[PDB]
A = this chain, B = another copy of it.
Amino acid sequence: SQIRQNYSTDVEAAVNSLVNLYLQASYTYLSLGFYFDRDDVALEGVSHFFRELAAAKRAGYERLLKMQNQRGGRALFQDIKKPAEDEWGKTPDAMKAAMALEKKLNQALLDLHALGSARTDPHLCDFLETHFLDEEVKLIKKMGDHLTNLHRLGGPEAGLGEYLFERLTLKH
């Protein structure tokens, strides 16, 4: 490559791999989105919530691919693993899956930052610092608040809670 400079093969490969993980996360959000649209689930706000995350994850991989091409990397794509569930339970359950997924994504981001720091690649460091690390933190905090609000709305009158949360917290 005629543009490539200070761009280790390890980083290139780990970017290809983070891209696959973005694609898979996106795909999971797509599943959660349509699940909450079913006539027998019917929580529009929750569906919108997850559909937006599908979009946000797509922006992620799109940006990772752009950076790949900018540094002189070559994108290689693998199969995209189907999401881990077909049915997502109730809002708390799905929000826990989301949380656990975001936690996984943030770990790979950190791992790639560690790896890039270890190759002394300040561009990669800066790039992650700018477009990803704060976004993940904000997103995780929001899911925390969401889980604390659902937890608070739980108990005997539980189905009532789900309704109100979707209506009064989630944009619809």
Contacts and interface: CB of A to CB of B under 8 A. Distances in A.
Interface of A: 1-3, 5-6, 23, 27, 30-31, 34-35, 37-42, 44, 65-66, 68-72, 74-83, 86, 99, 103, 106-107, 110, 113-114, 117, 120, 122-123, 125-130, 133-134, 137-138, 140-141, 143-149, 152-157, 159-165, 167-169
A37, A82, A152: which has the most chain B beta carbons within 10 Å?
A152
Given A3-B140, A5-B140, A70-B137, A79 B80 contact: yes
Nearest to A148: B42
Given A1-B39, A2-B39, A122 B113 contact: yes
Please state the number of chain copies in the assembly: 4
B137 A129 contact: no
Contacts of A38: 69, 74
B71 A137 contact: yes
A38 to B, nearest CB: 5
A129 B138 contact: no
